[PDB]
Amino acid sequence: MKPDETPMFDPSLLKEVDWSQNTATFSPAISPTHPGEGLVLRPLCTADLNRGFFKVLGQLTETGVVSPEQFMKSFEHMKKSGDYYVTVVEDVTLGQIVATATLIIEHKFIHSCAKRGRVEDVVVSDECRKQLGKLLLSTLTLLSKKLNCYKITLECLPQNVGFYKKFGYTVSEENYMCRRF
Amino acid sequence: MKPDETPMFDPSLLKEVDWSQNTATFSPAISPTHPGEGLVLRPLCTADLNRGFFKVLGQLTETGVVSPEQFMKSFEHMKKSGDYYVTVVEDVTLGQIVATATLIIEHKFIHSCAKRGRVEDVVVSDECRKQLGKLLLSTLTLLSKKLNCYKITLECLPQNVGFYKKFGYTVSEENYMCRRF
């Protein structure tokens, strides 16, 4: 039970995607396979722990004091389900995570027992203002349409609506309601 | 692999909840244990298939042609995860489902590896205009705060915002964006 290089899902699944079906604009043109010079687009592994993964998460929102056992426990149950796709971009020649986004598969009974996707926890490093945000969002979206998700949704503040539209997301009429404890 | 009376989760988990911590108004006063005359509040079992479960789902939104094997497959993987809580109200003296709502647990790395809840697929039968909607929403919400979810969210159209507020949900500033395929 110690951090290693085991991924959460089959890496080939990211290189397997129909990148011809990309909606976004890329200049210079990049891909899942070749995401940028120095860069690796892959699944999250437990070793990423050391490599700034929380440094990057900590930009988007609170990450408290995270123990190693709690992170591997969380990861293990995420790997176990097959429903989580935490997807990271590492700057290889630094040993540092520079971007993350999560795909989540919800299983449903409606629309003839369809699956649906949720995009969570999207953050690009302060450092890399390298086209990662586009790359992650277009990759994950396309993965969802291949894991036979009928739809995929996400929540985001107004300022970011425009960003998400380049992937063919649109504003729904439905409000988002929350309650903490 | 045939429909039976096995629940998706431990039924005691619904009767276990801190019903004193209820936010909603009930006249006459009902509970998870005693949900109404004739009624049972419990987990979804695969036998529910026969018992109008889709009749009720079909009110909220499309359910296409659903095979038995696809429903048990979906159910099985939902049971397997521990993260799904499809929760049903059956009118016992009819063999009929009259209400459903789903709790879903998302595992995260943020807020020190917290869990969060999602309320999905809320429908009360055309027949029972018996306090079920309140009962389900207050039960599930309370379950979430006990499965150590730091928060719980849902999406809903404007007309239903007021309904959700009696459970201590509130409008977030975040838009809801969708894309189908």
Swiss-Prot record, chains A, B:
Acetyl-CoA binds at K130, Q131, L132, G133, K134, Y164, K165, K166. It is found in: Golgi apparatus membrane; Endosome membrane. It is an enzyme of class 2 (transferase). Keywords: Acyltransferase, Disease variant, Dwarfism, Endosome, Golgi apparatus, Membrane, Transferase. Pathway: Nucleotide-sugar biosynthesis; UDP-N-acetyl-alpha-D-glucosamine biosynthesis; N-acetyl-alpha-D-glucosamine 1-phosphate from alpha-D-glucosamine 6-phosphate (route I): step 1/2. It comes from the Eukaryota. Its main location: Golgi. Substrate binds at T61, K108, F109, I110, H111, E120, D121, V122, Y150, K151, E174, R180. GO terms for biological process: cellular response to leukemia inhibitory factor; UDP-N-acetylglucosamine biosynthetic process. Signal peptide: none annotated. Residues 39-181 form the N-acetyltransferase domain. Changing E155A: Reduces affinity for glucosamine-6-phosphate 6-fold. SUPFAM superfamilies: Acyl-CoA N-acyltransferases (Nat) (SSF55729). One of its GO terms (cellular component) is Golgi membrane. It is a peripheral membrane protein. One of its GO terms (molecular function) is glucosamine 6-phosphate N-acetyltransferase activity. Homodimer. Belongs to the acetyltransferase family. GNA1 subfamily. It is linked to Rhizomelic dysplasia, Ain-Naz type: An autosomal recessive skeletal dysplasia characterized by short stature, marked rhizomelic shortening of the limbs, platyspondyly, hip dysplasia, and large hands and feet relative to height. This is Glucosamine 6-phosphate N-acetyltransferase. It comes from Homo sapiens.
